[PDB]
Amino acid sequence: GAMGSMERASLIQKAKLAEQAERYEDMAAFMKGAVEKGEELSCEERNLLSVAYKNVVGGQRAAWRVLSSIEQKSNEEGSEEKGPEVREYREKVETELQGVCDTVLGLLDSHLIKEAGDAESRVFYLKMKGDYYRYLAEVATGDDKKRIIDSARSAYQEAMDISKKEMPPTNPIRLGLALNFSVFHYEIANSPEEAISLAKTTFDEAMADLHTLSEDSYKDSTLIMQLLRDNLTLWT
């Protein structure tokens, strides 16, 4: 890899600089390099990894949606034929997006997840695995779409099982996992009732645990509870 000659600590330092400069492709390449050093990631380092790739794939998802909308418009009735270009360029962006998802899933599989023993790391990485299979599922149309969806579901489910056994209901990782799994149910699995039930139950159980928290943890947890409520307002 191109980062093989740089010190792990320097890769982490430059990932943080790239974040400040809003250079998220650089940030992701630095954190990929850090992961490939082979040592486990600290909590702060895990969040750098997630932020970097989330911003990269988020730009690609936004672009793919714009191009997909145009492509569907061009396939309507009375729409003038304009050649293969829209499909070609949507396919180009889609392939780049799938490449980023495969890269993240490859890092989790080699070898972040198998080395993660603590609940906070293991749940974090399994949520990530579910997330990036979900982004693959958003663009999937072929014979393996069902298998991609089930890989997202399976990763989210293992993360949920661990989070419910090992973490309090206000834990931000647990909350963010349930938020995203709920959107998986609504958007990918065509199960809006499961999505609503998960979001409501997650919100209610966190509400009842807030009294145990410090002011700073209370702010951390209520921020994500508000996102659960935002989705519930969207959906009901």
Partner: peptide, 9 residues
Amino acid sequence: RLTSTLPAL
């Protein structure tokens, strides 16, 4: 796209 997931951009 109006649904909220984490991390956010």
